[PDB]
Amino acid sequence: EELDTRETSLLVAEVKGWLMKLASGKGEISPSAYDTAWVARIPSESDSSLPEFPEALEWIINSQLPDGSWGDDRHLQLYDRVLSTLSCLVTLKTWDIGHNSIAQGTKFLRENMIKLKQDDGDLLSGFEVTFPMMLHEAKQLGLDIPYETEFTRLLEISTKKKLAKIPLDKIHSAPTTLLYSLEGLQDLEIDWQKILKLQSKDGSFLSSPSSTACVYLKTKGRKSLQYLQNAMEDQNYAVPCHYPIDLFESLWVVDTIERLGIDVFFRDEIKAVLDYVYSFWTNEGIGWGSTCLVNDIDDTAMAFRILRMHGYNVSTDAFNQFWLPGDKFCCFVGELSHGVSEMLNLHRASQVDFPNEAILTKTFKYSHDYLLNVDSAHMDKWATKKNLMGEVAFELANPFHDCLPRIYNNAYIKHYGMDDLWIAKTIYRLPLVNNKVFLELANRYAQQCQLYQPAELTKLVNWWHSSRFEDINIDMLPYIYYVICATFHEQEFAQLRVFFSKACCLNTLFDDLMDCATSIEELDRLQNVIEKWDISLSHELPLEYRIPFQEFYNTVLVMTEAASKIHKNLSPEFICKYLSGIYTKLIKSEIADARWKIEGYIPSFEEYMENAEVSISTWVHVLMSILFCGEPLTEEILNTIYDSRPLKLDRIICRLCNDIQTYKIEMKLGQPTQGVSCYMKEHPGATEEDALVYLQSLLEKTKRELNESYFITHENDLPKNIKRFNFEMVRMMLITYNETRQVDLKDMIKFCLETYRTLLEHHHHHH
Numbered sequence: 001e002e003l004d005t006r007e008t009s010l011l012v013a014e015v016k017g018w019l020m021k022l023a024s025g026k027g028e029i030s031p032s033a034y035d036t037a038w039v040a041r042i043p044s045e046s047d048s049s050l051p052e053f054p055e056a057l058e059w060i061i062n063s064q065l066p067d068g069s070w071g072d073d074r075h076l077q078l079y080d081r082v083l084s085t086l087s088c089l090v091t092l093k094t095w096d097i098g099h100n101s102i103a104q105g106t107k108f109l110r111e112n113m114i115k116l117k118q119d120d121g122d123l124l125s126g127f128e129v130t131f132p133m134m135l136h137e138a139k140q141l142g143l144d145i146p147y148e149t150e151f152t153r154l155l156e157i158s159t160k161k162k163l164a165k166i167p168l169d170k171i172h173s174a175p176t177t178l179l180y181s182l183e184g185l186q187d188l189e190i191d192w193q194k195i196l197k198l199q200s201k202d203g204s205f206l207s208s209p210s211s212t213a214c215v216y217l218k219t220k221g222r223k224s225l226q227y228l229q230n231a232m233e234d235q236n237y238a239v240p241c242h243y244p245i246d247l248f249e250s251l252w253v254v255d256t257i258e259r260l261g262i263d264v265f266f267r268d269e270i271k272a273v274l275d276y277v278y279s280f281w282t283n284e285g286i287g288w289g290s291t292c293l294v295n296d297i298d299d300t301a302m303a304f305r306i307l308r309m310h311g312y313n314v315s316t317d318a319f320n321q322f323w324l325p326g327d328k329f330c331c332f333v334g335e336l337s338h339g340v341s342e343m344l345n346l347h348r349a350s351q352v353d354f355p356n357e358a359i360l361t362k363t364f365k366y367s368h369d370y371l372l373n374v375d376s377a378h379m380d381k382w383a384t385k386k387n388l389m390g391e392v393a394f395e396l397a398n399p400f401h402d403c404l405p406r407i408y409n410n411a412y413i414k415h416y417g418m419d420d421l422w423i424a425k426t427i428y429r430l431p432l433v434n435n436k437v438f439l440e441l442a443n444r445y446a447q448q449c450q451l452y453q454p455a456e457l458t459k460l461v462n463w464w465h466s467s468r469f470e471d472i473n474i475d476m477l478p479y480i481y482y483v484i485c486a487t488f489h490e491q492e493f494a495q496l497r498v499f500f501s502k503a504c505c506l507n508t509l510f511d512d513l514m515d516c517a518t519s520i521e522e523l524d525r526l527q528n529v530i531e532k533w534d535i536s537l538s539h540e541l542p543l544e545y546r547i548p549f550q551e552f553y554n555t556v557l558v559m560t561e562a563a564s565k566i567h568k569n570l571s572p573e574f575i576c577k578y579l580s581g582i583y584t585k586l587i588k589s590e591i592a593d594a595r596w597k598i599e600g601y602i603p604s605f606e607e608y609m610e611n612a613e614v615s616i617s618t619w620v621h622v623l624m625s626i627l628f629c630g631e632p633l634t635e636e637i638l639n640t641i642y643d644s645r646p647l648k649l650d651r652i653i654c655r656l657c658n659d660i661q662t663y664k665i666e667m668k669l670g671q672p673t674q675g676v677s678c679y680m681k682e683h684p685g686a687t688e689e690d691a692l693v694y695l696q697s698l699l700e701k702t703k704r705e706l707n708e709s710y711f712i713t714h715e716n717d718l719p720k721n722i723k724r725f726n727f728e729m730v731r732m733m734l735i736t737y738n739e740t741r742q743v744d745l746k747d748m749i750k751f752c753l754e755t756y757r758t759l760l761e762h763h764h765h766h767h
Contacts, residue, residue, distance in 0.1 A: 001443070002440070003418070003436040003439055003440040003443075004436055004437060004440040008441070008444055011437050011440060011441050012265045012266075012441070014437060015257075015265070015266065015269075015437060015438070015441070016265075016266060016269045018253070018432050019253070019254075019266060019269035019270065019272065019273055020269055020272060022246070022249065022250040022253060022273050022276070022432065023250070023269070023272035023273045023275070023276045024276070025244065025246040025276065025290065026246075027244075027245070027246060027249040027250065027253075027430075027432055028249075028430070028431045028432050029240040029241075029242075029243070029245065029249070029428060029429070029430055030072070030240060030428045030429040030430075030431075031059075031063075031235065031238030031239060031240055032084075032209075032238075032239060032240050032241045032425065032426050032428060033060065033063065033070035033071055033084040033085075033087065033088055033426070034070075034071075034083055034084045034087040034088075034130075034210065034241075034425060034426045035087075035208070035209040035210045035239050035240065035241055035425065035426075036056050036059060036060060036209075036237075036238045036239050037056075037060055037070075037084075037087040037088040037090065037091040037092075038087055038091070038183060038209065038210035038213050038214075039053060039056060039209045039210065039213045039228055039231075039232065039239055040053045040056035040057050040060065040091050040095075041090075041091050041094055041213065041217070042213055042216065042217065042225070042228065045225075051095055052229075053232055053237060055232075055236075055237035056232060056237045056238065056239075057091070057092070057095060057097060057098070058237075059237055059238045060088050060091065060092065060098070060101070061092075061097075061098050061101050063238070064088070064101050064104065064105065067108055068085070068104035068105050068106075068107050068108030069081040069082075069084065069085045069105070069108045069112070070084040070085050070087075070088045070105075071083075071084035071085065071426060071427065072421065072426070072427040072428070072429070074419070074421075075421055075427065077120075077121040077122075077382075077427060078112065078115055078116055078120060078121065079116070079120070079121050079122075079123075079124050079127060079131070080121075080124065080426050080427040081108075081112070082109065082112065082113065082116060082131070083124065083127070083130060083131055083134060083426060084426055085105050085108060085109060086109070086131075086134040086135060086137075086138050087134060087210075088101070088105060089102055089105045089106065089109075089138055089141075089143055089145075090134065090137045090138050090141060090143075092105075093138075093141045093142075093143060094141065102143070106143055106144045106145050109143075109145040109146065110144070110145060110146060113145065113146040113149055113152075114146065114149055116149060116151040116152065117151055118151070121382055122382050122384060122423045123423075124423060124424070124425060124426055124427075125177075125180060125181065125241075125423070125424045125425050126177075126178070126180060126181025126184055126425060128155065128158070128159045128162065128184075129159060129163075129178075129181055129184025129185060130181055130183065130184045130425070131152070131155065132152065132155060132156045132159055132184075133183065133184045133186055133187070135147065135152060163188070168188060168189060168190055168191070169191075171185070171190060171195070172190070172191050172194040172195045172197070172198060174198075174334065175198055175206075175293055175294050175334070176334065177206075177332075177335075179195075179198055179205045179206045179208075179211060179293070180205070180206040180207075180208045180211055180242075180425070181208070181211055181425070182195070182205055182208075182211040182214045182215055183210050183211055183213070183214035186214060186218075192215065192218040192219050193219060195215060195218075195219075196215065196219055196221055196224075198293070199215075199221070199223065199224065199293075200291050200292055200293045201291040201292075202223070202227050202291035203221065203222075203223030203224040203225075203226060203227035204224070204227045204243075204291065205224075206242070206292075206293055207242040207243055207244070207245070207288070207289060207291070207292055207293075208241065208242055208425060209227075209228060209231055209239040209240075209241075209242075209243060210425065212224050212227055212228060213228060216228065231243050240428055241424040241425040241426055241428050242288070242289075242424060242425070243289075244289045244290065244291065245288045245289050246276075246289050246290055247277060247280060247286050247287070247288055247289055247290060247292075247299055247303070248288040248289065248299055248302075249430060249432065249433070250273050250276065250277055251277060251299065251302045251303055251306060252302070252430070252433050253273070253432050253433055254270055254273055254274065254306060255302060255306060256416070256433055256434075256438060257270065257438065258270075258306070259408070259409070259412040259416075260409060260412060260413060260416060260438055260439070260441075260442040261405065261406065261408075261409030261410075261412075261413075261442060261445060261446070261489075262438065262441045262442050262445055264445065264490065265441065265445075270310075271310075274306065274307060274310055274312065277303055277306075277307065278307055278312050281303055281307060281312075281314060282295075282318070283315050283317050283318060284317075284318055284321060285297070285299070285300030285303065285304065285318035285319070285321075286299050286300055286303050287299055294332060294333065295318075295321065295333075296331050296332050296342070297319070297322045297329060297330065297331045297332075297338075297342055297346055298331055298341060298342035298345055298346075300318050300319065300322075301319075301342070301345040301346045301348070301349035301363075302345050302349070304316070304318060304319075304349050305345070305348055305349040305352055308352050308711055309352060309711055310711075311711060311712060311713050313712075316353070316354075316357040316359050316360055317359075319359050319360070319363055320359060321333060323359070323362070327362040327365065327366060328366055329346065329362075329363055329366050329367070340371070340374055340379060340380075340388060340392060341388070343367045343370045343371055344367075344371065344391060344392055344395055346363050346366075346367040347364065347367040347368060347371060347395055348395065348400070349363070350363045350364035350367060351364065351399065351400035351401070352400065352707055352711060353704050353707060354704055354707055354708040355701070355704045355705060355708060357704075368396070371392050371395065371396055372396065374389070374392065376389050376392075376393075379392075384420060384421050384422065384423055385417055385420045386415060386416065386417030386419075386420060387414070387415040387417070390414075390415050391412070391415050394408075394411050394412075394415070397740060397741070398741070399734075399738070401703055401730065401731055401734050402731065402734045402735045402738045402741060403731065403735065404483060404486035404487050404728070404731055404732065404735060405486060405487060405489065405728075406446075406449060406485065406486040406487075406489050407486050407735075409442070409446070410446060413439070413442050413443070413446065416438070416439055416442070417434055418434055418435055418436050418438070418439045419434060420433075420434040421434075448491065449485065449489045451491075452491055452494060453481075453485065453748070453751075454751070456481070456494060456497060456498055457477075457478075457481060457748065457751055457752055457755065458755055459498060460477055460481065460498060460501050460502070460505075460752075461474070461477070461752050461755045461756050461759070462759065463502060464477060464505070464756070465756065465759045465760075467547070467551040467554075468547055468551075469505075469509060469547065469548070469551070471547060472509075472513070472544050472547045472548070473509075474752065474756060475749065475752075476504075476505060476508055477501065477505060477752055478745065478748035478749040478751075478752050479736075479745070480500075480501045480504045480505060480508075481497065481501050481748060482745050482748055483732045483735070483736070484496075484497045484500045484501060484732070485497060487728035487731065487732060488500075488629075488725070488728070492630060493628070493629070493630075495562060495628045496625050496628040496629055499555075499559055499562070499624065499625065499627075499628055500621055500624075500625050502555050503555070503620070503621055503624055503625075504621060506548060506551060506552050506555065507586065507617050507620070509548045510545075510548050510549075510552070510587060510590070511590050511617070513544055513545060513548065514526075514587075514590050514591060514594045515594060517594045517598065519598060520595050520598050520599070522542045522545075523591050523594055523595055523598075525540060525541060525542065526541060526542070526545055526549075526587075526591060527587075527588060527591050528540075529541055529549065530549070530583075530584050530587050530588065530591075531584060531588070533553070533580040533583075533584060535549075535550065535553045538550055538553075552583065556576065556579045556580055556583065557576070559575075559579055559624065559627070560572055560575045560576040560579060562627075562628070563575050563579075563627040563628065566627070566628070567627070567632075567633050569632075569633075569634070570633065570635065570638075574635060574638075575627070578623075578638050579624060582620050582623050582624065582642075583620065585614065585620075586614065586615070586617060586620045589611050589612075589614035589615040590615045590617075592611050592615070593611065593612065593615050593674070596674070597674065602674070602677055602678055602681050603678060604678065604681070604682050605678050605679050605681075605682040605683075606682075607678075608674065608675070608678040609652075609655065612655050612659075612674075612675070613648075613651040613652060613655050614651065616651060616654045616655040616658055616733075618650055618651065618654045618729050618730070618732075618733050619642065619647050619650055619651050619729075621729060622641075622647060622650065622722075622725055622726050622729050623638075623641060623642060623647075625725055626641070626721075626722045626725060629721040629722060629724075629725050630721050631719040631720070631721045631722055632719070637718075637719075641718065641722070644718060645709055646706070646709050646710065646718060646723060646726045646727075647726060649702055649705055649706045649709060649730075650706070650726050650729060650730050652698075652702050653699065653702050653703060653706060653730050653733075653734075654729075654730060654733040654734075655675075656695050656696075656698055656699040656702070657699060657733065657734055657737050658733075658737060659673060659674075659675030659676070659695060660675075660692060660695050660696060660699065661737040661739065662675070663675065663676050663688070663691075663692065675691070675695065676688050676691040676692065676695075679691040679694065679695070706727070706730065709723075710723055710726075710727045
C-alpha cells in the first residue's frame with residue numbers, strides 16, 4: 001500500500017516546488033521520439049550539411065529502447081512504437097549517422113510491422129496521415145523494412161479516400177485538426193504560404209513541433225524556426241508532441257490535488273498557479289496554452305470552475321462560442337465530434353453557476369445527457385486512465401451541492417491513476433499530473449482524517465450514555481458524525497465536530513418527540529420552560545422532555561465554557577445568552593409546527609415559510625459552530641449573522657429541499673404535506689405538481705444565489721470559515737435528503753455499537 005517511504009515534509013516540499021514551477025509556466029511532459037526526430041531533420045541555416053540540432057540526434061541515439069524501438073517505454077503500443085521508430089530511422093538515415101541504431105531499429109520493424117492491426121490501441125492523432133507518410137519516407141531512404149502489410153495497404157486506401165473528400169482551400173481557410181499533422185500532408189498541393197496565417201502566437205502549428213517543422217521546411221518562416229529553436233533549448237533537445245501546454249498542465253495538476261483532497265498542504269502555491277492561469281484567462285476562455293491558436297471547452301471549463309471557486313471573476317460568456325443549434329456544445333469550434341473528458345469537466349463547471357447565467361443551464365443539460373448516454377463497455381477501453389467511466393458514474397450520481405469533500409476525495413483516491421498515460425501524436429506522460437507522490441500524500445491525509453475518530457466517537461457514545469437518552473436511537477450518531485467529518489476534516493476542528501454532533505443529536509431527539517406530541521397543552525408547557533431557559537422548571541415539563549431539555553441545558557453550559565476560553569473578547573454571559581437564545585428560537589418554531597399540525601391550521605405560504613425556515617434547524621448549527629470554526633468573533637457578528645444573506649439562503653434552500661422530498665414520502669402515505677398544502681391554499685388553482693415545480697424552481701434559483709454569495713468575496717463579508725460552514729451545512733442537508741445517495745460509514749456504526757455495549761455490559765463479557 002505504501003508508495004513512497006520519505007517523510008511527509010519531504011513529499012510536501014517536493015510538490016510545492018513543482019507547483020511554483022508551474023506558476024511560472026514550467027512543467028514536465030515526456031519527450032516525443034517522433035517529434036524530436038522530425039525536428040532534428042532541420043539543417044543549419046548557414047550550412048545545410050550540418051544539422052541545426054545535433055544534440056537532438058545524440059538524444060535519439062541514446063534513447064533507443066533495448067528491443068530497437070522508440071516510443072513509450074512503460075506501455076508498449078504498436079502504433080506508438082512503429083510510428084516513433086520510423087521517424088527516428090528516417091532522421092538518422094537522412095544525416096547518415098547512427099548505423100547501429102538503424103540496424104537495431106530496422107530489425108524491430110522487420111519483426112513487428114506484421115503485428116500491426118486495426119482496433120489494437122488508441123488512435124494516435126493524425127495517425128491516418130502520419131503513418132503512411134513516414135513509411136513512404138523510410139521507403140525512399142532505402143531502409144531494410146517491410147514496406148507493406150495488409151494493414152498498411154488498407155490504411156493508405158482508406159486515408160486517400162478520406163483525403164479526396166476535403167477541399168484543400170479549407171485547410172488554410174480556418175483552423176482545423178489537420179494543422180496538428182501537416183507533416184502527413186507533405187505531398188498534397190497545399191498552399192503552404194497561406195497556411196502561415198494559421199500559425200499560433202509563437203509560430204507553431206497547433207503547438208506541434210513536427211507539424212511546425214514541416215511548415216518551416218516548406219516556407220522557411222522565421223517565427224516557426226524560432227519556436228523550434230526555443231522549444232529545443234527549453235526541453236534539453238528532446239521535444240514533446242505539443243508545447244507549451246502550460247495552462248492545461250497547471251490546471252490539471254491543481255484539479256488533481258483538489259480532487260484527491262491534498263490541497264490542505266498547498267494553499268499558497270495553488271494561489272500562485274491560479275494567479276498565473278488568471279493572467280491568461282479571457283472573456284473567450286482559454287486553450288491548452290498561453291500561445292495556443294484556439295480556445296477549447298475542456299480548458300475553458302476547467303479554468304472557469306477552479307478560478308470561480310477560488311474567488312476570481314470569470315464570465316460565463318466564455319462558453320458562448322461553443323454553442324450549437326439545439327443547445328448543444330462543441331469542444332473545438334468546427335470539430336467533427338468530441339470526447340468524454342471535456343463533458344465531465346463541462347458538467348462540473350455548470351454547477352457553480354450564478355444568477356442570470358442561463359448558458360450554464362444549457363451546458364449542464366447538454367453534458368448531463370451526453371454523460372448518461374456514453375457506451376460504458378467501450379469507454380477508454382485501453383485504460384489510458386485508471387477508471388474514467390468510474391469518474392463519470394460518480395459525477396452523474398453526486399450533484400455538486402449534494403456531495404461532501406471527503407466523500408468525493410475518498411472516491412477519487414480509488415479512481416486516480418498514478419501511471420496514466422495520454423494520447424496525442426504519440427503516447428505521452430504528464431509526471432506532475434500522474435505520480436506516486438500525490439497518491440501517497442492522499443493516503444496519508446486520509447489516514448490522518450481517521451486518527452481522531454475513535455476518541456471523538458468514544459466521547460460521543462459516553463455522552464449519550466451519561467445523558468440517559470436511553471431512558472425516554474443511538475444509530476443517529478454515526479451518520480451525524482460521518483457528515484461532519486466529511487466537511488470539517490482538518491484535525492483542528494475536533495471541538496466543532498463534537499459540539500455539532502451533540503447539537504444535532506439533541507435537536508433530532510427533541511423534534512422526534514415534538515412530532516409525536518399527543519396534544520397542544522404539553523407543547524405550551526414546554527414552550528414556557530424553554531422561553532425562560534430555566535432548569536429549575538424541568539419538573540413542570542412532561543417527563544419525556546425532561547431528559548433532553550436537561551441535557552440541552554447542560555450542553556449549552558459546556559459549549560459556553562469552551563467558547564469563552566477561545567474568545568477572550570466575549571463574555572461568558574454574552575455567549576450563554578447567545579446560545580440559549582438560538583436554541584430557544586429553534587425549539588419555539590418546531591413547537592409552532594407541531595401546534596399547527598394538531599390544530600390543522602394552514603397558514604399562507606409566506607406565513608408558513610416565516611416559521612418553517614426557522615424550524616428546518618440547519619441555521620442553529622451554523623450559529624453555534626461558528627464559535628469553534630477558528631475565526632475571531634465580535635458581538636456585532638453574533639448579533640447580525642442570523643439575518644445575514646448567506647444564513648437566509650441556507651434556511652430557504654434547506655426548507656425547500658426538505659419539503660420537496662417530504663412530499664414524495666407523504667404521497668405514498670395518506671397524509672398531505674404542509675409545504676405543498678400551504679402553497680395550494682395560497683394559490684387556489686395549483687396542482688400538487690405545480691406546487692412542486694414552483695418549489696423546485698425556487699430551490700434552484702436560491703442555490704445559484706448561494707454560490708454567488710459563497711465563492712465571491714464581498715465587502716463586509718463573513719469570515720472565511722463561517723462562510724465555509726454555512727455552505728457545508730447546506731450540502732450536509734442536501735446529501736441527507738438525496739434519496740439516490742442514502743439508498744447506497746459501516747466502520748462508524750459498528751464502532752459506536754461495540755463501544756456502547758461495553759458501557760452497558762460495563763466490565764463483564766457475555767456469551
